[PDB]
Design a protein around this nucleic acid. Structure first.
Ligand SMILES: [Mg+2]
Ligand SMILES: [Mg+2]
Ligand SMILES: [Mg+2]
Lengths: 54, 95, 109, 52, 287, 127
RNA sequence: ACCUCGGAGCAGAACCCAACCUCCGAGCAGUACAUGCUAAGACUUCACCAGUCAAAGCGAACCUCAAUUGAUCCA
C-alpha cells in the first residue's frame, strides 16, 4: 500500500492513529482534602522543574 | 499558643505542628495518616495502601495550622534535591 | 435490659438515579443485600456496591434472572418453580456516551 | 489459640512478613513472593511475634 | 496637565485643607450605643464572653487534630539542609541585556549581587546560586559564570555560546563576605580564606562533569566534548577568540575575592591595602 | 596572582598549562534540524537515509527496512521528539534515537500471528 | 442497670431521626499465602479522625462472615 500511494497514485501516504479521548479529572480544588499527594500531578502538564520569576 | 513571648514579645510556633505536618508554599498542609504503622497484621492491603499515603489537609485544618506556626515556616525554601519541590507552586487552577 | 442498638444509619441507597451522567468508577448505589444487580457496564465490589465501568447514563431495567450454575442457592430456588415461572430482578446499566476513540490523521509520509 | 509469627525469606533476604498459625501445628514453611528477588521463594518462620 | 491648572483657581493648600485618601481610614468601632455595645459582641455569658476560651488547637477534650496524627520527619533537619537560590538563564540574559551584569568581566557572585539580579541571604542558610536550565534556548551570551551548582543543560547552554561555567564553594562566612563585601571592609578584619567543601560535597566539586573548581583542568575537554555531542552543538574552542584571557580567570580555592588575597586588610578610608609580612601569618593565610 | 596550597597547579601538577583545559560520530551539517513549538516543543531531525555516507551500507539497509515506517517519500528518515520544553533536550532525544538505530541495526502481535495462520489455512487452494 | 461496635422495629416508599425505648447479637473463627506493587474515579455514619469501593497498569495465576475493634506519645 506504500507502493500504491507512492508509485501509481502519486501522493504521500496518509498515516492515521487511533486517538483515545483525554482522561476525565474533576475540577481542581484549593484544598483537596484527604486526596493523596499525587493529586497535584493530575492537573499539571509539564514534568519538569519550573522556576517562576527567578 | 503564645501570642506574645515574655522575652521577645513575638509569636511562637507550636512545635507539635512542625513535628507532624508539612507546609507547602501554596498553602497546603501535607500529613501522614493516623495509624499507618499500627496493627498492620489485621488490615487489608487496600487499607494499608490507603494508610501509607501523604494526605492533604482541610481548609480549616490548614488555617488552624497557619495560625499555630510563624512566618519562618511559610517561606520559600530552595533545597538541593527536595522530594516535595514540584508540589510547592500550584499549577493550572481555575480558582 | 435492652443494651445495644445504638448503631447509626449506613447512608446507603442510590447515588446516581436514572438519567444521570456518570464517569468511570462512580459508585452508582451501595446496598446491603442485592436490591439492584449489576447490568451492562456496571461492576460490583466486595461490599455489593454497584459502580460504573464506562462513562454514560444510568438506566434501570427489569430483566430475567438466570443465576450461575455453580450458585447452588439460587439454582435450587429455580428448580422448585413451576414450569412457566420466571424470576425477574431490577438491573442497573450504564449506556456508554462516548466512542472509545477516533482515527486521526497523524502524518503525510 | 492462634499465634502471629514472622516469616523470613530464605533468599533475597531481609524480607519478612507476618502470618497467623495455630499454637499446636508445626512450624510453617511457605512459598511467598519476594519483591527483592521478584519471585516466589520459600519462607521459614523464625519467631512468634504475639499470641493473638 | 489640567490639574495644576485647576490648582490655580483653588485656595492655597494649608494644614487646614488636608484630608486622607477616601478608603484609607476605616472608622474605629467602639462599644458604645445601642448597636456596638450592650453585650459588646461577646454574645451570651459563657466562657467566650468571660474572656477565657482555651488555647488554639484545644478541641474541648477529645484528642486534638494536631496530635492524633503521627510524627513524621518532614521538617527533620530543615535548618541544616543547604539552599541555593535559582538563577535562570532567562534571568541572566535579562540582566546582561539591561547593562546590569557586564559579561566582558567574570561573573562572580558579587557581580550578581551588585547588579541586584539575585538576592541571597547567608542566614536562612542559602549556600549561594544554582544555575537553572530555564531559558536555555534563546540564551545568546558569551559569559564566564561562577555558580555554586549547575544543571547539565545550563552548562550546555553556556558552553555552547563560547562560555565557561565553574562551580565554586562558599562557607556561610565566606558567602556572607562575598555577597555584601563593603560591610565586611568596615569590619576591620583581614580577608579570611574560604574553606574547602565538607565530605558530602567534595565528590561534587572534584568532578569535571559538573565543572568543579577542584577538578582536573585535564578532564574538562572530555566533558565539554561529551555535552557537545549529547546536545548537538559543535564545541567552539575558547582559545581562539580575544576574550580568552578573560574567560580563563578563576580565583583559586581559599580566595574569596578576585584580585585580592586572604590576610589583607582593606583600608576603605585612605584607599590602601595593608598586607602582612610576618612568616607565621603567611603560612596561615597561604595554606 | 595569589596561589595557595590548593591551587590547581599543586593539586594536579601534571596538567599545568592554561590550554590544557580547553584543547579538544554523527555529523550535524548533514542532518536537517527543525523546530515547532507545538506545553512541549518538538524537535525534528530528518536526513536522507540513502545518501548517508556516515552510516555503513548494511546498516543503511537494516535501517532502511526496520525503520521503514519513518522513511519519507523522498527517502528521508524523519524522527521527532516532543518530550520536553527545552529544544536541547528534544534534539538530544532525536540524536539518541539515531545512535540507537545504528547500534541496534549493526547488531498484540499474537492476534496477528493467528489471523495470518488462518489466512494461510484459507490459502490452501490451488489450481 | 449501663458506657464501644453491628442487625431489626420505632423510622411502612431517597438519605437522616431520639429515649434508663422494644428485641437480637459482637469483642472471633476458618481458608489462603500475589491477604503483591501501583492507580483513574467515587462513597462515607451528619464535622474531624477514622472508615469503605475501585477500572486501567506492572507482576502473577489460568478471601468467607455484619459486628469481629483502640489515636498520639512512648517503649
Ligand atoms: Mg437502629
Ligand atoms: Mg443514632
Ligand atoms: Mg459526611
Amino acid at each position: 500500500v506504500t507502493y500504491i500511494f507512492h508509485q501509481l497514485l502519486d501522493m504521500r501516504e496518509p498515516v492515521f492513529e487511533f486517538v483515545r479521548p483525554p482522561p476525565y479529572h474533576p475540577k481542581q480544588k484549593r484544598f483537596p482534602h484527604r486526596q493523596p499527594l499525587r493529586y497535584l500531578d493530575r492537573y499539571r502538564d509539564s514534568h519538569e522543574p519550573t522556576y517562576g520569576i527567578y | 499558643l503564645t501570642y506574645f513571648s515574655a522575652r521577645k514579645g513575638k509569636r511562637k510556633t507550636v512545635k507539635a505542628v512542625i513535628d507532624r505536618f508539612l507546609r507547602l508554599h501554596c498553602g497546603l498542609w501535607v500529613r501522614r495518616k493516623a495509624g499507618y504503622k499500627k496493627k498492620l497484621w489485621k488490615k487489608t492491603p487496600a487499607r494499608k495502601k490507603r494508610l501509607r499515603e501523604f494526605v492533604f489537609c482541610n481548609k480549616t485544618q490548614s488555617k488552624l495550622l497557619d495560625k499555630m506556626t510563624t512566618s519562618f515556616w511559610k517561606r520559600r525554601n530552595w533545597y538541593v534535591d527536595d522530594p516535595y519541590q514540584k508540589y510547592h507552586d500550584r499549577t493550572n487552577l481555575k480558582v | 435490659k435492652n443494651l445495644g442498638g445504638k448503631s447509626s444509619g449506613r447512608r446507603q441507597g442510590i447515588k446516581k438515579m436514572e438519567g444521570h451522567y456518570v464517569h468511570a468508577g462512580n459508585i452508582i448505589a451501595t446496598q446491603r443485600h442485592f436490591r439492584w444487580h449489576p447490568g451492562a457496564h456496571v461492576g460490583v465490589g466486595k461490599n455489593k456496591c454497584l459502580y460504573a465501568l464506562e462513562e454514560g447514563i444510568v438506566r434501570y431495567t427489569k430483566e430475567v434472572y438466570v443465576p450461575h450454575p455453580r450458585n447452588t442457592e439460587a439454582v435450587d430456588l429455580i428448580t422448585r418453580l413451576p414450569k412457566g415461572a420466571v424470576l425477574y430482578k431490577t438491573f442497573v446499566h450504564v449506556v456508554p456516551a462516548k466512542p472509545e476513540g477516533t482515527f486521526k490523521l497523524v502524518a503525510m509520509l | 489459640k492462634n499465634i502471629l509469627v514472622r516469616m523470613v525469606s530464605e533468599a533475597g533476604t531481609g524480607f519478612c512478613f507476618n502470618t497467623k498459625r495455630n499454637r499446636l501445628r508445626e512450624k510453617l514453611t511457605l512459598l511467598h513472593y519476594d519483591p527483592v528477588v521478584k519471585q516466589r521463594v520459600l519462607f521459614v518462620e523464625k519467631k512468634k511475634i504475639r499470641s493473638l | 496637565a489640567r490639574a495644576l491648572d485647576l490648582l490655580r483657581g483653588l485656595p492655597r493648600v494649608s494644614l487646614a485643607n488636608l484630608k486622607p485618601n477616601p478608603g484609607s481610614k476605616k472608622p474605629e468601632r467602639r462599644p458604645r450605643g445601642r448597636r456596638r455595645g450592650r453585650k459588646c459582641g461577646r454574645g451570651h455569658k459563657g466562657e467566650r464572653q468571660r474572656g477565657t476560651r482555651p488555647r488554639l488547637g484545644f478541641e474541648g477534650g477529645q484528642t486534638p487534630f494536631y496530635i492524633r496524627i503521627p510524627k513524621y520527619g518532614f521538617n527533620e533537619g530543615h535548618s541544616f539542609r543547604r539552599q541555593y537560590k535559582p538563577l535562570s538563564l532567562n534571568r541572566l540574559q535579562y540582566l546582561i541585556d539591561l547593562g546590569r551584569v557586564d559579561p566582558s568581566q567574570p561573573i562572580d557572585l558579587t557581580q550578581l549581587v551588585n547588579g541586584r539580579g539575585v538576592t541571597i541571604q547567608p542566614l536562612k542558610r542559602d549556600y549561594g546560586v544554582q544555575l537553572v536550565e530555564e531559558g536555555a534556548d534563546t540564551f545568546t551570551a558569551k559569559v564566564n559564570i561562577e555558580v555554586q551548582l549547575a544543571s547539565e543543560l545550563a552548562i550546555a547552554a553556556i558552553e555552547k555560546n563560547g562560555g565557561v561555567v565553574t562551580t565554586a564553594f562558599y562557607d556561610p562566612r565566606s558567602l556572607d563576605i562575598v555577597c555584601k563585601p563593603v560591610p565586611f571592609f568596615l569590619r576591620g578584619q583581614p580577608i579570611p580564606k574560604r574553606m574547602l567543601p565538607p565530605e558530602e560535597l567534595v565528590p561534587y566539586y572534584t568532578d569535571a562533569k559538573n565543572r568543579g573548581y577542584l577538578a582536573d583542568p585535564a578532564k574538562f575537554p572530555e566533558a565539554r566534548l561529551e555535552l557537545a555531542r549529547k546536545y548537538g552543538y559543535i564545541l567552539p574552542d575558547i582559545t581562539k577568540d580575544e576574550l580568552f584571557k578573560m574567560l580563563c580567570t578563576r580565583k583559586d580555592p581559599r580566595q574569596i575575592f578576585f584580585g585580592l588575597a586572604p590576610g589583607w586588610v582593606v583600608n576603605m578610608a585612605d584607599k590602601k591595602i595593608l598586607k602582612p609580612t610576618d612568616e607565621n601569618l603567611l603560612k596561615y593565610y597561604t595554606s | 596572582e595569589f596561589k595557595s596550597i590548593y591551587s590547581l597547579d599543586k593539586l594536579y601538577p601534571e596538567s599545568q598549562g592554561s590550554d590544557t583545559a580547553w584543547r579538544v560520530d554523527i555529523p550535524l551539517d548533514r542532518l536537517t534540524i527543525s523546530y515547532c513549538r507545538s506545553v512541549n516543543s518538538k524537535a525534528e531531525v530528518r536526513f536522507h537515509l540513502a545518501t548517508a555516507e556516515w552510516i555503513a551500507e548494511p546498516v543503511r539497509q537494516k535501517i532502511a527496512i526496520t525503520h521503514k515506517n519513518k522513511i519519507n517519500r523522498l527517502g528521508e528518515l524523519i524522527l521527532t521528539s516532543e518530550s520536553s520544553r527545552y529544544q536541547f533536550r528534544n534534539l538530544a532525544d532525536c540524536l539518541q534515537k539515531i545512535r540507537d538505530m545504528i547500534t541496534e541495526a549493526s547488531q498484540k502481535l499474537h492476534r496477528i500471528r493467528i489471523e495470518n495462520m488462518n489466512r494461510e489455512r484459507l490459502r490452501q487452494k490451488r489450481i
